[PDB]
Amino acid sequence: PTPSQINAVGIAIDKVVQEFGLHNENLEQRLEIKRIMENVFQHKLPDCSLRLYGSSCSRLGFKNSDVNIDIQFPAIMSQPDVLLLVQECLKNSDSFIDVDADFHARVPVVVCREKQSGLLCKVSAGNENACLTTKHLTALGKLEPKLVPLVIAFRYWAKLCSIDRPEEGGLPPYVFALMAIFFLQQRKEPLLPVYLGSWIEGFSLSKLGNFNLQDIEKDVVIWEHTPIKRGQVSLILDVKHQPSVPVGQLWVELLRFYALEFNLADLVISIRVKELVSRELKDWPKKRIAIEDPYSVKRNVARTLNSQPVFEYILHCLRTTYKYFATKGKSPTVVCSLCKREGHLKKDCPEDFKLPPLTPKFLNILDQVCIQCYKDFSPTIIEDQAREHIRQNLESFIRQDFPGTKLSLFGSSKNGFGFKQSDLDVCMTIVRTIEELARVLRKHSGLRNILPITTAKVPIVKFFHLRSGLEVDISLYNTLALHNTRLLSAYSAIDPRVKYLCYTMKVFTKMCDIGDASRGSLSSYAYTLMVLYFLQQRNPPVIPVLQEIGWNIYFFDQIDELPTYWSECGKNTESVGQLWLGLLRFYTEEFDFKEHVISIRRKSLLTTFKKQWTSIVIEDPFDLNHNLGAGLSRKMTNFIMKAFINGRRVFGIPVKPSKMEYFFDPDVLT
RNA sequence: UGAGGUAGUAGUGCCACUGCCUUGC
Numbered sequence: 001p002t003p004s005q006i007n008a009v010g011i012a013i014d015k016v017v018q019e020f021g022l023h024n025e026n027l028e029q030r031l032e033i034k035r036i037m038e039n040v041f042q043h044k045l046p047d048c049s050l051r052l053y054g055s056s057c058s059r060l061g062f063k064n065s066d067v068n069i070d071i072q073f074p075a076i077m078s079q080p081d082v083l084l085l086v087q088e089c090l091k092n093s094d095s096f097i098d099v100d101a102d103f104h105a106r107v108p109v110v111v112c113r114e115k116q117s118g119l120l121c122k123v124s125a126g127n128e129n130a131c132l133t134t135k136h137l138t139a140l141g142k143l144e145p146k147l148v149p150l151v152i153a154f155r156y157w158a159k160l161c162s163i164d165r166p167e168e169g170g171l172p173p174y175v176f177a178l179m180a181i182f183f184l185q186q187r188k189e190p191l192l193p194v195y196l197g198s199w200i201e202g203f204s205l206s207k208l209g210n211f212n213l214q215d216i217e218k219d220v221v222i223w224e225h226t227p228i229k230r231g232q233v234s235l236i237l238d239v240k241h242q243p244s245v246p247v248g249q250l251w252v253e254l255l256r257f258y259a260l261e262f263n264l265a266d267l268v269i270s271i272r273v274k275e276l277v278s279r280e281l282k283d284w285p286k287k288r289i290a291i292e293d294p295y296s297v298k299r300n301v302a303r304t305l306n307s308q309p310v311f312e313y314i315l316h317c318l319r320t321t322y323k324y325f326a327t328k329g330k331s332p333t334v335v336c337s338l339c340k341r342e343g344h345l346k347k348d349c350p351e352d353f354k355l356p357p358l359t360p361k362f363l364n365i366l367d368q369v370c371i372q373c374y375k376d377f378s379p380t381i382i383e384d385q386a387r388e389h390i391r392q393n394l395e396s397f398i399r400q401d402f403p404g405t406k407l408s409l410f411g412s413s414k415n416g417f418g419f420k421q422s423d424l425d426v427c428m429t430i431v432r433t434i435e436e437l438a439r440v441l442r443k444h445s446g447l448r449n450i451l452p453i454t455t456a457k458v459p460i461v462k463f464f465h466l467r468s469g470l471e472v473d474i475s476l477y478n479t480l481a482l483h484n485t486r487l488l489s490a491y492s493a494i495d496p497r498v499k500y501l502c503y504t505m506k507v508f509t510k511m512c513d514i515g516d517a518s519r520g521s522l523s524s525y526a527y528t529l530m531v532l533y534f535l536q537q538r539n540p541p542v543i544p545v546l547q548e549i550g551w552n553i554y555f556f557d558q559i560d561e562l563p564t565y566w567s568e569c570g571k572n573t574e575s576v577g578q579l580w581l582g583l584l585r586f587y588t589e590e591f592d593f594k595e596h597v598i599s600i601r602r603k604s605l606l607t608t609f610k611k612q613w614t615s616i617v618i619e620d621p622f623d624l625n626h627n628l629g630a631g632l633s634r635k636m637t638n639f640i641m642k643a644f645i646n647g648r649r650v651f652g653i654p655v656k657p658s659k660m661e662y663f664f665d666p667d668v669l670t
Numbered sequence: 671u672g673a674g675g676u677a678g679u680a681g682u683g684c685c686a687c688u689g690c691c692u693u694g695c
C-alpha cells in the first residue's frame with residue numbers, strides 16, 4: 001500500500017466514528033437512560049443490579065444501535081422470573097412504550113423503547129461472557145486508539161453489506177470485532193500480545209481446552225487453568241518501539257489478511273495462542289467460519305453461518321472491499337427457517353401457519369359419527385381377553401429365565417382409553433438387562449422379529465406376535481407411564497364425553513398417519529394431552545384439574561365425589577361433535593404453541609419460557625422437564641398442523657359408503 | 671435391525687451409500 005491513501009482512508013475511518021458512531025455525548029445519554037432504568041427498578045428490584053454492556057459500553061457500534069442492558073440478578077433470583085417482572089415493570093411504567101416480548105430469540109431478551117430518547121433497548125439476564133468480551137474490547141480500544149476506528153469501520157461495512165443481521169445468515173457484529181482484534185494479534189509486528197503465553201509452565205496445544213480467561217482486573221488479564229495454575233499477562237507489552245502506521249494501514253492489513261492471506265475455511269479465527277490452531281486439533285467443522293469467544297472455550301460463535309453460498313458471498317465482499325481499499329452489485333443469500341433455504345424471508349415462511357352456519361342436523365350427524373367410531377373401535381371383551389392372555393403368556397415364558405418378574409399392562413389396553421389396531425405396550429419390573437431380555441425373547445419361537453432399542457429415550461424391546469398378530473413393546477422398569485395413563489383413564493371415567501372425544505381424536509390421528517412415535521411424530525399420549533387441555537380450557541369447565549384440584553404423583557382419584565370438590569359440576573351442555581369442532585377451531589385458530597405449553601398439570605397457563613423450551617411443545621404433567629416434541633422436527637410439526645387444519649375444515653362445513661368413511665379420510669385430511 | 675442434523679465417496683435437481691452421535695415407550 002501507500003501512506004497517502006492510508007491517511008485518506010483514515011480520514012473516513014475517523015469520520016464514520018464521528019458520525020453514526022458512539023461519541024462521548026451518546027455514552028452519557030446511554031448512562032442517563034441506565035440511571036432512569038435504575039430508578040424504574042428501584043422499588044421492584046432493590047437486591048438486583050443493572051449493568052451496561054454491549055455496543056453501548058464498547059463504543060464499537062452506532063448511535064442507532066440498540067441499548068444493551070444486563071440484569072446481574074443475585075443467586076437467589078432466577079432468569080425467567082427476573083426477566084418477566086422486568087417486562088412487567090417496563091409495561092406499567094409510562095416512560096417506555098411498545099413494550100413487547102422477544103423471548104423467542106436465541107438470547108433471552110426483552111425489547112423496550114423510550115418515547116423521549118426514541119432509542120431501541122434490549123434487556124438481558126446472565127450472559128456474562130458478552131459483558132466480559134465487551135469490557136475487554138473497550139479496554140483494548142481505550143489503550144489502543146487505532147482499534148476503535150477499525151472495529152467501527154468493520155461494523156459499518158457489515159451493516160452496509162447486510163451481514164450484521166443474524167437472521168439473514170450473517171455473523172454477529174461482536175464476532176466481527178473479535179475477528180478484527182484477532183487480526184491485530186496475528187499480523188506481523190503485532191501490536192498486542194496473547195493472554196496465553198507458550199512460556200508459561202504446563203502449557204500444551206492439546207491443553208487449550210482446559211485453559212480459560214476469566215476477566216480483566218486492574219488492566220491485567222486474568223486466566224485460569226484446570227492444582228490450578230494462573231499466570232498474569234499485561235494487556236500491553238513493555239515495548240516503546242511499535243509501528244506508527246495510521247489506522248488506514250491497519251484496516252488495509254485486516255482486509256489483506258482476511259481476504260487473501262488467511263483461509264477462512266481451513267483454520268479457526270480464535271485468539272487463544274500465537275500458534276495457528278489446526279481445525280482438527282479442537283474438532284470443529286472445516287466447512288464454514290468457526291470462532292470461539294475468548295471467555296467461552298466451548299462455544300462456536302460462528303454458528304449463525306450455516307450456508308456455503310453465504311460463505312461465498314462474504315468472501316466475495318471481502319475481496320471486493322479489499323480491492324476498493326487497495327459491497328454492492330449483489331444480494332445476500334438470505335437463510336431462513338424453512339430447511340435453511342432462501343424461500344421467503346425468515347419473518348414469514350411457508351412452514352409457519354397463520355362457511356355456512358352450524359345446523360342441528362349436522363351437529364347430530366357429527367355426534368352420531370363420533371359415537372359410531374367409538375363403538376366400532378371400542379375394544380371388545382374378547383379383544384381385551386386376548387390382549388391380557390398374550391401378556392400373561394409372555395410373562396409366563398419370561399419367568400423361566402427371570403423368576404419373580406412382574407409384567408404389567410399399561411396404555412390403551414389397560415388403565416387407559418381403548419382402541420383397535422393399536423400397538424400394545426407393557427412394563428417390566430423385577431443396558432445389559434435389556435440385551436438379556438432381547439436375547440431371551442429371541443430364544444422364543446412364537447415371536448419371530450425382535451427390534452431392541454437401548455439408545456432411545458427409554459430402553460425398549462419390541463416384537464411382533466404371530467398368534468395374536470400384534471406389535472408388543474416392553475419397557476424396562478418404567479412406572480411413570482403407568483401413572484400418566486392412569487390420570488387420563490380417571491379423566492375419561494369422570495365423564496363419557498371425554499372418552500368419546502379421545503376416541504375420536506385417536507381415530508383421526510391413526511387415520512391421518514401422524515401417531516407413529518418411531519417415525520418421530522407425536523405419540524397418542526401427546527394427542528390425549530392436547531384433548532385433555534382443550535377439555536380443561538373450555539369456557540365451562542368440563543373436567544376439573546385432578547392435579548392441583550422423582551416427580552409429583554399425587555392427584556385426585558375419587559370419581560364418585562368429584563361434584564363435592566367441583567363447584568362448577570355439569571356446567572357444559574355442548575354435544576360431543578360440538579366439543580370436537582370446538583377443539584379443532586381452538587387448535588387451528590385462537591391458539592399458539594410458540595408462547596404456550598400444552599400442560600394439564602395446573603389450570604393456569606404456563607408460558608414456554610418458564611420451561612426454557614425456546615424452540616409444538618407438549619409438557620408431560622408428571623415429568624415437567626420431559627417434552628414429547630423434543631425429538632420432533634419442524635417438518636413433522638407442520639405436517640401435523642396441516643392435518644389438524646384439514647380436519648377442522650372438513651368437520652366445520654355442514655354437508656347434506658358410510659358416514660364413518662366420509663370423516664377421518666386419509667386422502668381428504670392429507 | 672429405523673426417521674432427522676454433520677465430514678466424505680466414483681459416474682454427473684444428478685442421490686445412493688458410508689465414520690460418530692442426540693433421537694427410533
Ligand SMILES: O=c1ccn([C@@H]2O[C@H](CO[P@](=O)(S)OP(=O)(O)OP(=O)(O)O)[C@@H](O)[C@H]2O)c(=O)[nH]1
Pocket residue numbers: 410411412413419422423424425426480481482484485517523524525526627628695
Ligand atoms: O413421551 C412419552 C411418555 C409416555 N408415553 C406412554 O405411552 C402410553 C400411551 O401409549 P399410546 O400413545 S395410547 O400408544 P398405543 O399404541 O395407542 O397403545 P400402547 O400404550 O403403546 O400399548 C402412556 O402410558 C404414556 O405414559 C409415550 O408414549 N411417550
